[PDB]
Design an enzyme around this catalytic site. Structure first.
Site, PDB file in Angstrom:
ATOM      1  CG  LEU A  75      -1.829  -1.223   1.394  1.00 58.75           C
ATOM      2  CD1 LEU A  75      -2.556  -1.152   2.724  1.00 58.75           C
ATOM      3  CD2 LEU A  75      -2.819  -1.342   0.244  1.00 58.75           C
ATOM      4  N   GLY A  77      -0.793   4.654  -1.099  1.00 61.28           N
ATOM      5  CA  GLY A  77      -1.677   5.690  -1.595  1.00 61.28           C
ATOM      6  C   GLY A  77      -2.140   6.679  -0.545  1.00 61.28           C
ATOM      7  CD  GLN A 156      -5.486   5.535  -3.041  1.00 65.01           C
ATOM      8  OE1 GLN A 156      -5.132   4.614  -2.304  1.00 65.01           O
ATOM      9  NE2 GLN A 156      -5.614   6.782  -2.612  1.00 65.01           N
ATOM     10  N   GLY A 184      -9.883   5.114   1.470  1.00 61.53           N
ATOM     11  CA  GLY A 184      -9.179   4.218   2.365  1.00 61.53           C
ATOM     12  C   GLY A 184      -8.523   3.066   1.625  1.00 61.53           C
ATOM     13  CG  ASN A 213      -0.122  -0.963   6.632  1.00 63.76           C
ATOM     14  OD1 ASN A 213      -1.086  -1.106   5.881  1.00 63.76           O
ATOM     15  ND2 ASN A 213      -0.239  -0.956   7.955  1.00 63.76           N
ATOM     16  CG  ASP A 215       3.406   2.134   7.832  1.00 64.98           C
ATOM     17  OD1 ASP A 215       2.314   2.140   7.226  1.00 64.98           O
ATOM     18  OD2 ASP A 215       3.558   1.602   8.952  1.00 64.98           O
ATOM     19  CE  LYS A 374       1.040   2.696  10.627  1.00 65.67           C
ATOM     20  NZ  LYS A 374       0.332   2.210   9.411  1.00 65.67           N
TER      21      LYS A 374
END
Ligand SMILES: O=c1ccn([C@@H]2O[C@H](COP(=O)(O)OP(=O)(O)O[C@H]3O[C@H](CO)[C@@H](O)[C@H](O)[C@H]3O)[C@@H](O)[C@H]2O)c(=O)[nH]1
Length: 482
Positions: A75, A77, A156, A184, A213, A215, A374
């Site tokens: 992911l 986006g 997305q 999302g 993720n 990250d 995060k």
């Protein structure tokens, strides 16, 4: 059958050439919101999960055919507005001279050299992350850039922000781009299906997709999970970690009890159904229970495994959508302007697909498969020596941490934004491998060669002047002040 507001959404979306799968998906959420749905999941409607299988107990690896049929997706986006980010978070530095995207590409290279020669790798981007990701690969990893458009990038969708009181599409003449928002990371299933890429992947022989993720640099393919899903016939698997004090932003696993009422003299047998509860889905006056890491001790890592032909079948059989529970995000159409019209931004979380499959399950994984970023407090821990680089280019907790990352508490007035966090470690990143807890209050600047051990607090009560910690300072079980 739709309301006028919903029809206005359809028309706007069609005029803008939004793919139909997205429109169908969005509208269904719009109908739910119009009937009072907010995505809220109260604690009275769920109960904790007490028993799960563990990856540490698995030993058997999948065969080569299963490994060859697995796609890896990252992911990419999101917009980390909480960290003061304007571009993709994966372009931030993690170690000396290496970004999230650097280690991600190195992980793919390693897997192709030692495990799966033709491993298919994908990135889900937004338009607010696409060009910078492509140009980065253009310079550093040209083998990924050459097939970027053809097979790597998944774009997305964008959905309209709707006015809170009428559910009509919001307008913003000053900047009409602000009338649209990402829906999302739950949009991954809609984007894969609507673009036809999900069908093409299944046609080409792919059967599994491992998503994680962007990250989290600890998430790579584990061939024991694929063998586990083959043997147990599991169509969706969520990796959960034992929740620590640092797990504040994300979602936790939960369960409900669905009674398959008795038949043929058999009694009503309970069957556990699993679900995800994001923090936004907890009633805001009940956030104490979401934050109780003992009540809900299984934290979603967003390391997800999906059997692609079953996801495809499920979506087709549901009008061409995956009916994930809607999350009603409250914002203003210009999130920087409190006087701009208030809107709902309908979103879904890709971990919520655990409620979409009969054979869905979760497995407890060790902490070395979960290194989230995060906040800037997370980035300080990841940049510090508390995390090391493995040979297959994962970022994992140092063995001395016993699976517990240092608890980092940074003053939100000075370090919430990336510019402020960059000032804190301007002269160097402190040693935190032996630091259990570090709290920074007031304006502080780390020195070069700082070594923190135990529980350390750095408190500057007069923030008119920054508190620079001397070079080589070693803080052990103490509170440092000017
Ligand atoms: O529209 C979006 C939103 C996010 N992302 C990406 O999704 C990933 C995760 O998003 P982030 O906003 O960083 O995290 P959350 O959505 O709050 O939480 C997710 O990740 C947590 C683990 O870190 C889990 O606990 C949660 O259940 C899971 O939903 C990141 O790579 C984002 O770039 C997208 O691609 N598109």
């Amino acid at each position: 059958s739709l309301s006028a507001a919903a029809q206005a959404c359809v028309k706007k979306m069609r005029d803008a050439k939004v793919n139909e799968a997205c429109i169908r998906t969005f509208i269904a959420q719009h109908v739910m919101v119009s009937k009072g749905e907010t995505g809220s999941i109260p604690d009275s409607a769920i109960m904790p999960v007490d028993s799960l299988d563990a990856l540490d107990s698995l030993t058997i690896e999948c065969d080569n055919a299963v490994l060859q049929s697995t796609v890896v997706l990252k992911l990419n986006g999101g917009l980390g507005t909480g960290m003061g980010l304007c571009d993709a978070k994966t372009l931030l530095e993690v170690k000396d001279g290496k970004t999230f995207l650097d280690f991600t590409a190195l992980q793919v290279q390693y897997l192709r050299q030692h495990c799966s020669e033709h491993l298919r790798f994908m990135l889900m981007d937004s338009f607010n992350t696409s060009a910078s990701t492509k140009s980065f690969l253009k310079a550093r990893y040209p083998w990924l850039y050459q097939v970027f458009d053809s097979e790597v990038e998944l774009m997305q969708n964008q959905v309209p922000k709707i006015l809170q009181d009428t559910l009509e599409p919001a307008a913003w003449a000053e900047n009409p781009a602000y009338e649209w928002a990402p829906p999302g990371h739950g949009d991954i299933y809609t984007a894969l299906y609507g673009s036809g890429k999900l069908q093409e992947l299944v046609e080409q022989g792919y059967r599994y997709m491992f998503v994680s993720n962007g990250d989290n640099l600890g998430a790579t393919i584990d061939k024991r999970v694929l063998a586990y899903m083959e043997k147990e016939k599991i169509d969706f698997l969520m990796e959960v970690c034992r929740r620590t004090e640092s797990d504040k932003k994300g979602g936790h696993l939960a369960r409900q009890t669905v009674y398959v009422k008795g038949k043929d003299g058999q009694p009503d047998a309970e069957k556990r159904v699993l679900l995800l509860r994001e923090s936004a889905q907890c009633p805001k006056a009940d956030m104490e229970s979401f934050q109780d890491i003992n009540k809900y001790s299984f934290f979603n890592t967003n390391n997800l495994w999906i059997r692609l032909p079953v996801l495809l079948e499920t979506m087709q059989e549901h009008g061409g959508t995956l009916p994930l529970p809607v999350i009603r995000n409250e914002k203003t159409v210009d999130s920087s302007n409190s006087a701009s019209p208030k809107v709902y931004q309908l979103e879904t979380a890709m971990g919520a697909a655990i409620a979409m499959f009969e054979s869905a399950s979760a497995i407890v994984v060790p902490r070395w498969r979960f290194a989230p970023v995060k906040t800037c407090a997370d980035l300080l821990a990841l940049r510090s020596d508390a995390y090391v680089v493995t040979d297959d280019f994962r970022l994992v907790l140092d063995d001395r941490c016993h699976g517990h990352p240092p608890v980092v508490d940074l003053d939100s007035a000075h370090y919430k934004m990336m510019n402020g966090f960059e000032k804190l470690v301007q002269h160097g990143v402190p040693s935190l491998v032996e630091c259990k807890r570090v709290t920074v209050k007031g304006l502080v600047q780390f020195g070069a060669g700082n070594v923190l051990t135990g529980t350390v607090t750095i408190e500057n009560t007069d923030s008119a002047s920054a508190f620079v910690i001397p070079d080589g300072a070693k803080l052990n079980d103490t509170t440092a002040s000017p």
